[PDB]
Enzyme design. Sequence first.
Site, short mmCIF file in Angstrom:
data_model
loop_
_atom_site.label_atom_id
_atom_site.label_comp_id
_atom_site.label_asym_id
_atom_site.label_seq_id
_atom_site.Cartn_x
_atom_site.Cartn_y
_atom_site.Cartn_z
N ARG A 29 0.88 -1.18 0.00
CA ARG A 29 0.00 0.00 0.00
C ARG A 29 0.92 1.24 0.00
O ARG A 29 1.81 1.34 0.84
CB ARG A 29 -0.83 0.01 1.29
CG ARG A 29 -1.58 1.32 1.53
CD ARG A 29 -2.59 1.57 0.34
NE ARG A 29 -3.66 2.53 0.69
CZ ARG A 29 -3.51 3.86 0.67
NH1 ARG A 29 -2.33 4.41 0.29
NH2 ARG A 29 -4.55 4.65 0.98
N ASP A 34 -3.98 8.90 -0.70
CA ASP A 34 -5.29 8.32 -0.88
C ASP A 34 -5.53 8.30 -2.39
O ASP A 34 -5.57 9.36 -3.04
CB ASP A 34 -6.33 9.21 -0.21
CG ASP A 34 -7.72 8.60 -0.30
OD1 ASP A 34 -7.81 7.35 -0.47
OD2 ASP A 34 -8.68 9.41 -0.21
N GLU A 37 -10.55 4.70 -5.72
CA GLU A 37 -10.82 3.31 -6.10
C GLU A 37 -11.41 3.34 -7.52
O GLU A 37 -11.74 4.39 -8.04
CB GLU A 37 -11.76 2.56 -5.12
CG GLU A 37 -11.28 2.58 -3.63
CD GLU A 37 -10.03 1.70 -3.37
OE1 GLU A 37 -9.84 0.70 -4.11
OE2 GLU A 37 -9.23 2.02 -2.44
N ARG A 75 -0.67 -5.44 4.48
CA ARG A 75 -0.03 -4.82 3.34
C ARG A 75 1.29 -4.17 3.77
O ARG A 75 1.37 -3.56 4.84
CB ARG A 75 -0.94 -3.75 2.72
CG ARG A 75 -2.31 -4.36 2.31
CD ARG A 75 -3.22 -3.30 1.66
NE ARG A 75 -3.55 -2.27 2.64
CZ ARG A 75 -4.35 -1.25 2.37
NH1 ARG A 75 -5.00 -1.22 1.20
NH2 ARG A 75 -4.55 -0.32 3.32
C1 LIG Z 1 -1.74 4.43 3.84
C2 LIG Z 1 -2.08 3.68 5.12
C3 LIG Z 1 -3.33 3.09 5.25
N1 LIG Z 1 -3.61 2.38 6.43
C4 LIG Z 1 -4.95 1.80 6.63
C5 LIG Z 1 -5.88 2.92 7.11
C6 LIG Z 1 -7.32 2.61 6.55
O1 LIG Z 1 -7.92 1.76 7.54
P1 LIG Z 1 -9.51 1.61 7.39
O2 LIG Z 1 -9.75 0.60 6.21
O3 LIG Z 1 -10.01 1.10 8.69
O4 LIG Z 1 -10.29 2.85 6.85
C7 LIG Z 1 -6.91 1.84 5.27
C8 LIG Z 1 -7.00 2.71 4.02
O5 LIG Z 1 -6.44 1.95 2.96
P2 LIG Z 1 -7.14 2.11 1.50
O6 LIG Z 1 -7.13 3.65 1.07
O7 LIG Z 1 -6.29 1.18 0.68
O8 LIG Z 1 -8.67 1.63 1.58
O9 LIG Z 1 -5.52 1.48 5.37
C9 LIG Z 1 -2.74 2.34 7.47
O10 LIG Z 1 -3.02 1.76 8.55
N2 LIG Z 1 -1.50 2.91 7.33
C10 LIG Z 1 -1.17 3.62 6.23
O11 LIG Z 1 -0.07 4.12 6.21
#
Ligand SMILES: Cc1cn([C@H]2C[C@H](OP(=O)(O)O)[C@@H](COP(=O)(O)O)O2)c(=O)[nH]c1=O
Length: 129
Positions: A29, A34, A37, A75
């Site tokens: 990831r 952000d 999608e 991820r």
């Molecule tokens: C970018 C990033 C996302 N995430 C988690 C936060 C969000 O949790 P929640 O799903 O509970 O909203 C999710 C968002 O990823 P996506 O934008 O891939 O959906 O990924 C982290 O924990 N650390 C990070 O550095």
Amino acid sequence: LHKEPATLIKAIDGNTEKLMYKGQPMVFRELLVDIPEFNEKYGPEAAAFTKKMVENAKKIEVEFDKGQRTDKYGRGLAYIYADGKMVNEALVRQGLAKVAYVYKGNNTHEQLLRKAEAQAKKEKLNIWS
Ligand SMILES: Cc1cn([C@H]2C[C@H](OP(=O)(O)O)[C@@H](COP(=O)(O)O)O2)c(=O)[nH]c1=O
């Protein structure tokens, strides 16, 4: 920070879902962004821009920051480079992602990415149109 090698793993559909890092398949990831999608506006464009950038590249590298290296979904959290150009920064600079998810300790490239976003916003590109 240091860059480390990885390679694209081509999924059954012809796209890259995972990278091979230290010889293991991993979903990565991108740190500090952000990305819309596929079903959202600019989502198809963000995906197509990413695919071209990584597939055209001779060398893919990942660069972990100083904090957590995997998120709660398993991820890998990294900055991704394609022939030395950061994919995270490039999406932001094109207005195909926003700076987001800035958590303590994994924030090394924050100012660099915010600089890219301001330019994309000034240029009214994509998400900022
Ligand atoms: C970018 C990033 C996302 N995430 C988690 C936060 C969000 O949790 P929640 O799903 O509970 O909203 C999710 C968002 O990823 P996506 O934008 O891939 O959906 O990924 C982290 O924990 N650390 C990070 O550095």
